[PDB]
Amino acid sequence: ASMQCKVILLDGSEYTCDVEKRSRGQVLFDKVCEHLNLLEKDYFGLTYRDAENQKNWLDPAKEIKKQVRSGAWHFSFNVKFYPPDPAQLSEDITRYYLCLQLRDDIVSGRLPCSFVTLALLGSYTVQSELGDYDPDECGSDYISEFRFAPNHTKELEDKVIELHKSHRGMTPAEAEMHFLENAKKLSMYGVDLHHAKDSEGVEIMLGVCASGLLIYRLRINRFAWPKVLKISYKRNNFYIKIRPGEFEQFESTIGFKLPNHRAAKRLWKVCVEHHTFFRLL
């Protein structure tokens, strides 16, 4: 009358529990956050891969059964809504799980940034995890475990060490806070990127975040939520209604062709959820 679930956590470890066969996603999410002693859980969710190996958020309001057709109820715990100002989070631990996610986002190449920013962010990670630089605990080899960037230059490594040396006295809470302030200013911070085609058939990327919808073709356009009147899908296609022009005198619907109905439905859902979260709480 129950099914085993496995969840990859942000530090790489694996949470196992059992849930009732007809459990809604909420059941499992609540168990994972309890495990994590996470009170600010609303920023977070669970992803799964479907039979086409596409990533999907587990809808907490719905039976897991209906979403994951396989009995392989394997999930990944992830940031869903990236806070525009992490300093305003109530708890250090929320910020910590947030850093872990952003570290992956960087290493995986999902959040690009300057060599400069990579080294600064790296040095904050090192101060958080290792503490103060010391020539006697720190060979010149003491940061061999850390990944900082999709690609490790021995010069990135030296710059991380240089900056680490300057952070002396800094507590994890502060290393992390500094980490979050440089990270939140990055261009792709918190943007969920989706492949699409525009009306001419030119391949573009439609990003969703706290502030609105982004189009990239090379970043191009950006629609703050306040200016999105309606978000909808039909078939392969994704639509937004906006009031263009200086005085917003008319409505215009802009359309994007997505690779299939399901890609359109995932984009639409993610956009709706972001609008609800960021604009209605």
Which amino acid is present at 116? Answer: V
Q: By what method was this entry solved?
A: X-ray
DSSP codes joined into one string, 191-204: -EEEEEE-TT--EE
* Nearest-angstrom CA–CA distance, 15 and 73: 12
Residue keyed to tokens 């030296």: 158
Q: Which DSSP state fits 58?
A: P
* Nearest-angstrom CA–CA distance, 189 and 253: 27
Q: Go through the chain and list every residue after which a break occurs, taking a C to next N gap over 2.5 angstroms, comma-separated.
A: 217
What does the buried/exposed string (b/e) look like for 156-179 if buried means 16 or more CB atoms within 10 Å of the residue's CB?
Answer: bbebbbebbeebeebebeebbbbb
Residue 265 near residue 233 (C-beta atoms within 8 A): yes
Residue 11: CB atoms within 10 A of its CB come to 10
Residue 5 near residue 65 (C-beta atoms within 8 A): no
Residue 206 near residue 193 (C-beta atoms within 8 A): yes
First vs last C-alpha separation in the chain:
36
Q: What are phi and psi of 214, to 5 degrees?
A: -120, 140
Count, residues in the chain: 281
Residue 131 near residue 90 (C-beta atoms within 8 A): no
Resolution (Å units): 2.3
Cα 148 to Cα 12, 77, 202, distances in angstroms: 16, 21, 33
Cα 230 to Cα 81, 197, 246, distances in angstroms: 20, 19, 19
Closest by CA to 77, choosing from 103, 51, 57, is 57
Residue 73 near residue 24 (C-beta atoms within 8 A): no
* Nearest-angstrom CA–CA distance, 179 and 137: 23
* Nearest-angstrom CA–CA distance, 160 and 143: 9
Cα 1 to Cα 18, 21, 34, 65, distances in angstroms: 10, 6, 23, 13
Cα 172–Cα 15–Cα 111 angle in degrees, nearest 5: 50
The full set of domains in the chain, from first to last, is 1-80 (3.10.20.90), 81-188 (1.20.80.10), 189-281 (2.30.29.30)
Closest by CA to 77, choosing from 19, 32, 115, is 32
